[PDB]
Amino acid sequence: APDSVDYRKKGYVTPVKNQGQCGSCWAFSSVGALEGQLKKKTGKLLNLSPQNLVDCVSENDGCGGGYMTNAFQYVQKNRGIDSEDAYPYVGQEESCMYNPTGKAAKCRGYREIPEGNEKALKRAVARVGPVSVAIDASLTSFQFYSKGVYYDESCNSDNLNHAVLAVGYGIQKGNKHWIIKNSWGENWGNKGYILMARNKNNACGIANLASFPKM
Numbered sequence: 001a002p003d004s005v006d007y008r009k010k011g012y013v014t015p016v017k018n019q020g021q022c023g024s025c026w027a028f029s030s031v032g033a034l035e036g037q038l039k040k041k042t043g044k045l046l047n048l049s050p051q052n053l054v055d056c057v058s059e060n061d062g063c064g065g066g067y068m069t070n071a072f073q074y075v076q077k078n079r080g081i082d083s084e085d086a087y088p089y090v091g092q093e094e095s096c097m098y099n100p101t102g103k104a105a106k107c108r109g110y111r112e113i114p115e116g117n118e119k120a121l122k123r124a125v126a127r128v129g130p131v132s133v134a135i136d137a138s139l140t141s142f143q144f145y146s147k148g149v150y151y152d153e154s155c156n157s158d159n160l161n162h163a164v165l166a167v168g169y170g171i172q173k174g175n176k177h178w179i180i181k182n183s184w185g186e187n188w189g190n191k192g193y194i195l196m197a198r199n200k201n202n203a204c205g206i207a208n209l210a211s212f213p214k215m
Protein backbone atom coordinates (compact mmCIF):
# COMPACT_ATOMS: atom_id res chain seq x y z
CA ALA A 1 0.00 0.00 0.00
CA PRO A 2 1.21 3.63 -0.58
CA ASP A 3 3.44 5.10 2.13
CA SER A 4 1.12 8.09 2.51
CA VAL A 5 -1.46 9.69 4.78
CA ASP A 6 -3.60 12.73 4.01
CA TYR A 7 -5.81 13.88 6.88
CA ARG A 8 -7.84 16.26 4.75
CA LYS A 9 -9.89 13.42 3.30
CA LYS A 10 -10.66 12.02 6.76
CA GLY A 11 -12.45 15.00 8.35
CA TYR A 12 -9.44 15.81 10.55
CA VAL A 13 -8.87 19.26 9.06
CA THR A 14 -10.91 22.49 8.94
CA PRO A 15 -11.26 25.10 6.16
CA VAL A 16 -8.17 27.18 5.37
CA LYS A 17 -8.14 30.45 7.30
CA ASN A 18 -6.45 33.77 6.56
CA GLN A 19 -4.35 35.24 9.35
CA GLY A 20 -4.55 38.78 8.00
CA GLN A 21 -2.05 41.41 9.17
CA CYS A 22 -1.67 39.71 12.55
CA GLY A 23 1.39 37.55 13.22
CA SER A 24 -0.77 34.78 14.67
CA CYS A 25 0.32 31.97 12.34
CA TRP A 26 1.50 30.21 15.51
CA ALA A 27 -2.07 30.45 16.89
CA PHE A 28 -3.59 28.95 13.76
CA SER A 29 -1.02 26.14 13.71
CA SER A 30 -1.55 25.28 17.39
CA VAL A 31 -5.32 25.25 16.91
CA GLY A 32 -4.91 23.08 13.82
CA ALA A 33 -3.27 20.33 15.84
CA LEU A 34 -5.94 20.70 18.52
CA GLU A 35 -8.67 20.16 15.91
CA GLY A 36 -7.00 17.07 14.49
CA GLN A 37 -6.85 15.39 17.90
CA LEU A 38 -10.41 16.46 18.72
CA LYS A 39 -11.66 14.60 15.65
CA LYS A 40 -9.52 11.61 16.64
CA LYS A 41 -11.05 11.39 20.13
CA THR A 42 -14.65 12.67 19.87
CA GLY A 43 -15.12 11.72 16.22
CA LYS A 44 -16.48 15.19 15.36
CA LEU A 45 -14.63 18.18 13.92
CA LEU A 46 -15.30 21.68 15.23
CA ASN A 47 -13.56 24.99 14.49
CA LEU A 48 -11.41 26.17 17.38
CA SER A 49 -10.52 29.76 18.32
CA PRO A 50 -7.08 31.12 17.24
CA GLN A 51 -8.04 34.50 18.75
CA ASN A 52 -8.53 32.82 22.15
CA LEU A 53 -4.81 32.01 22.02
CA VAL A 54 -3.73 35.37 20.65
CA ASP A 55 -5.23 37.33 23.55
CA CYS A 56 -4.67 34.82 26.37
CA VAL A 57 -1.25 33.14 25.98
CA SER A 58 0.67 35.89 27.79
CA GLU A 59 3.84 33.87 27.32
CA ASN A 60 3.57 34.85 23.66
CA ASP A 61 3.62 38.18 21.85
CA GLY A 62 0.11 38.10 20.36
CA CYS A 63 0.31 39.40 16.78
CA GLY A 64 4.05 39.79 17.32
CA GLY A 65 4.68 36.08 17.73
CA GLY A 66 4.62 32.94 19.79
CA TYR A 67 5.45 29.25 20.13
CA MET A 68 2.86 26.50 19.71
CA THR A 69 4.10 24.71 22.83
CA ASN A 70 3.21 27.84 24.86
CA ALA A 71 -0.33 27.77 23.48
CA PHE A 72 -0.63 24.07 24.32
CA GLN A 73 0.56 24.66 27.87
CA TYR A 74 -2.15 27.34 28.04
CA VAL A 75 -5.11 25.08 27.07
CA GLN A 76 -3.88 22.57 29.65
CA LYS A 77 -3.34 25.04 32.52
CA ASN A 78 -6.51 26.99 31.75
CA ARG A 79 -8.35 23.77 30.79
CA GLY A 80 -10.36 24.83 27.79
CA ILE A 81 -10.22 26.70 24.52
CA ASP A 82 -13.28 28.31 22.95
CA SER A 83 -14.68 27.57 19.53
CA GLU A 84 -14.66 30.13 16.72
CA ASP A 85 -18.35 31.03 17.25
CA ALA A 86 -17.49 31.32 20.94
CA TYR A 87 -14.49 33.64 20.48
CA PRO A 88 -14.24 35.03 16.88
CA TYR A 89 -11.04 36.14 15.18
CA VAL A 90 -10.88 39.96 15.04
CA GLY A 91 -7.56 40.12 13.25
CA GLN A 92 -5.81 41.90 16.10
CA GLU A 93 -4.83 41.88 19.75
CA GLU A 94 -7.43 42.54 22.42
CA SER A 95 -8.19 41.72 26.04
CA CYS A 96 -8.39 37.99 26.77
CA MET A 97 -12.08 37.10 26.75
CA TYR A 98 -12.18 33.37 27.43
CA ASN A 99 -15.83 32.42 27.79
CA PRO A 100 -15.75 29.12 29.76
CA THR A 101 -19.17 28.14 28.41
CA GLY A 102 -17.90 28.25 24.83
CA LYS A 103 -15.15 25.73 25.70
CA ALA A 104 -14.83 23.14 22.94
CA ALA A 105 -11.61 21.30 23.81
CA LYS A 106 -9.07 20.36 26.50
CA CYS A 107 -5.55 18.93 26.36
CA ARG A 108 -3.26 17.17 28.85
CA GLY A 109 0.20 18.39 27.87
CA TYR A 110 2.23 18.18 24.66
CA ARG A 111 5.09 16.34 23.00
CA GLU A 112 7.94 17.81 20.92
CA ILE A 113 9.86 15.98 18.16
CA PRO A 114 13.65 15.44 18.14
CA GLU A 115 15.12 18.59 16.68
CA GLY A 116 15.93 17.82 13.05
CA ASN A 117 14.25 14.43 12.92
CA GLU A 118 12.28 13.78 9.72
CA LYS A 119 11.90 10.05 10.35
CA ALA A 120 10.38 10.72 13.76
CA LEU A 121 8.19 13.46 12.31
CA LYS A 122 6.83 11.06 9.70
CA ARG A 123 6.03 8.63 12.52
CA ALA A 124 4.28 11.38 14.49
CA VAL A 125 2.10 12.56 11.60
CA ALA A 126 1.38 8.90 10.89
CA ARG A 127 0.60 7.88 14.48
CA VAL A 128 -0.80 11.06 16.07
CA GLY A 129 -2.07 13.05 13.10
CA PRO A 130 -1.69 16.80 12.30
CA VAL A 131 1.51 18.11 13.86
CA SER A 132 2.38 21.77 14.38
CA VAL A 133 5.68 22.66 12.64
CA ALA A 134 7.62 25.91 12.04
CA ILE A 135 9.57 26.70 8.88
CA ASP A 136 11.45 29.42 7.00
CA ALA A 137 8.80 31.19 4.94
CA SER A 138 10.92 34.29 4.25
CA LEU A 139 11.62 33.45 0.59
CA THR A 140 9.81 34.67 -2.56
CA SER A 141 9.82 31.25 -4.26
CA PHE A 142 7.81 30.01 -1.31
CA GLN A 143 5.35 32.88 -1.31
CA PHE A 144 4.35 32.71 -4.99
CA TYR A 145 4.15 28.89 -4.99
CA SER A 146 1.22 27.40 -6.89
CA LYS A 147 1.76 23.67 -7.46
CA GLY A 148 4.27 20.85 -7.15
CA VAL A 149 6.76 19.81 -4.50
CA TYR A 150 8.50 22.93 -3.19
CA TYR A 151 12.27 22.92 -2.86
CA ASP A 152 14.85 25.73 -2.85
CA GLU A 153 18.45 25.29 -1.70
CA SER A 154 18.29 28.60 0.19
CA CYS A 155 15.46 27.76 2.59
CA ASN A 156 17.24 28.30 5.90
CA SER A 157 16.70 25.65 8.58
CA ASP A 158 18.03 28.25 11.04
CA ASN A 159 15.44 30.94 10.34
CA LEU A 160 12.13 29.48 11.52
CA ASN A 161 9.73 32.40 11.13
CA HIS A 162 6.42 30.91 10.03
CA ALA A 163 4.41 28.30 11.97
CA VAL A 164 2.32 25.92 9.89
CA LEU A 165 0.69 22.46 10.13
CA ALA A 166 1.61 19.07 8.65
CA VAL A 167 -1.54 17.24 7.45
CA GLY A 168 0.29 14.27 5.95
CA TYR A 169 2.99 13.25 3.47
CA GLY A 170 3.40 11.23 0.28
CA ILE A 171 4.96 11.06 -3.16
CA GLN A 172 3.24 13.22 -5.76
CA LYS A 173 5.29 11.65 -8.53
CA GLY A 174 8.74 10.47 -7.62
CA ASN A 175 9.11 13.22 -5.03
CA LYS A 176 8.56 12.68 -1.30
CA HIS A 177 6.54 15.51 0.24
CA TRP A 178 4.99 16.94 3.40
CA ILE A 179 1.42 18.17 2.89
CA ILE A 180 1.29 21.58 4.58
CA LYS A 181 -1.69 23.69 5.68
CA ASN A 182 -0.72 27.39 5.59
CA SER A 183 -2.91 30.23 6.94
CA TRP A 184 -2.98 32.82 4.15
CA GLY A 185 -6.57 32.43 2.95
CA GLU A 186 -7.41 29.82 0.32
CA ASN A 187 -6.37 32.15 -2.47
CA TRP A 188 -2.72 31.41 -1.59
CA GLY A 189 -0.76 28.49 -3.05
CA ASN A 190 -2.78 25.38 -3.86
CA LYS A 191 -6.10 26.41 -2.24
CA GLY A 192 -4.32 27.18 1.02
CA TYR A 193 -1.95 24.19 0.99
CA ILE A 194 1.63 23.57 -0.14
CA LEU A 195 3.65 20.40 -0.69
CA MET A 196 7.16 20.73 0.65
CA ALA A 197 10.11 18.40 -0.02
CA ARG A 198 10.52 15.47 2.39
CA ASN A 199 13.88 13.81 3.06
CA LYS A 200 15.89 16.28 0.98
CA ASN A 201 17.94 16.99 4.10
CA ASN A 202 15.53 18.65 6.55
CA ALA A 203 14.12 21.05 3.91
CA CYS A 204 13.32 24.46 5.43
CA GLY A 205 13.85 23.03 8.91
CA ILE A 206 10.33 21.61 8.85
CA ALA A 207 11.37 19.25 11.65
CA ASN A 208 13.02 21.75 14.03
CA LEU A 209 10.10 23.10 16.04
CA ALA A 210 7.52 20.37 15.66
CA SER A 211 5.18 19.41 18.50
CA PHE A 212 1.77 17.91 19.11
CA PRO A 213 -0.72 18.30 21.94
CA LYS A 214 -1.66 15.30 24.02
CA MET A 215 -5.39 14.77 24.38
Ligand SMILES: *C(=O)([C][N]C(=O)[C]([C][C]([C])[C])[N]C(=O)O[C]C1=[C][C]=[C][C]=[C]1)[C][N]C(=O)[C]([C][C]([C])[C])[N]C(=O)O[C]C1=[C][C]=[C][C]=[C]1
Nearest residue numbers: 020021023024025026064065066134137160161162163184
Ligand atom coordinates in the same frame (compact mmCIF):
# COMPACT_ATOMS: atom_id res chain seq x y z
C1 LIG B 1 3.32 34.06 12.16
O1 LIG B 1 2.29 34.67 11.92
C2 LIG B 1 4.47 34.68 11.39
N1 LIG B 1 4.06 35.43 10.20
C3 LIG B 1 4.48 35.14 8.96
O2 LIG B 1 5.25 34.20 8.75
C4 LIG B 1 4.02 36.01 7.79
C5 LIG B 1 4.82 37.32 7.79
C6 LIG B 1 5.53 37.71 6.49
C7 LIG B 1 6.66 38.67 6.81
C8 LIG B 1 6.06 36.49 5.72
N2 LIG B 1 2.59 36.23 7.51
C9 LIG B 1 1.93 37.38 7.73
O3 LIG B 1 2.44 38.39 8.22
O4 LIG B 1 0.58 37.38 7.34
C10 LIG B 1 0.20 38.41 6.41
C11 LIG B 1 -0.51 37.92 5.17
C12 LIG B 1 -1.79 37.40 5.25
C13 LIG B 1 -2.43 36.92 4.11
C14 LIG B 1 -1.77 36.95 2.87
C15 LIG B 1 -0.49 37.48 2.79
C16 LIG B 1 0.13 37.96 3.93
C17 LIG B 1 3.59 34.05 13.62
N3 LIG B 1 4.84 33.35 13.91
C18 LIG B 1 5.70 33.72 14.85
O5 LIG B 1 5.53 34.68 15.58
C19 LIG B 1 6.95 32.86 14.99
C20 LIG B 1 6.63 31.66 15.87
C21 LIG B 1 7.32 30.35 15.53
C22 LIG B 1 7.82 30.36 14.08
C23 LIG B 1 8.47 30.17 16.49
N4 LIG B 1 8.07 33.64 15.54
C24 LIG B 1 9.27 33.60 14.95
O6 LIG B 1 9.46 32.91 13.95
O7 LIG B 1 10.30 34.38 15.53
C25 LIG B 1 10.95 33.97 16.74
C26 LIG B 1 11.78 32.71 16.77
C27 LIG B 1 12.99 32.68 17.45
C28 LIG B 1 13.78 31.53 17.45
C29 LIG B 1 13.34 30.39 16.77
C30 LIG B 1 12.13 30.41 16.08
C31 LIG B 1 11.36 31.56 16.09
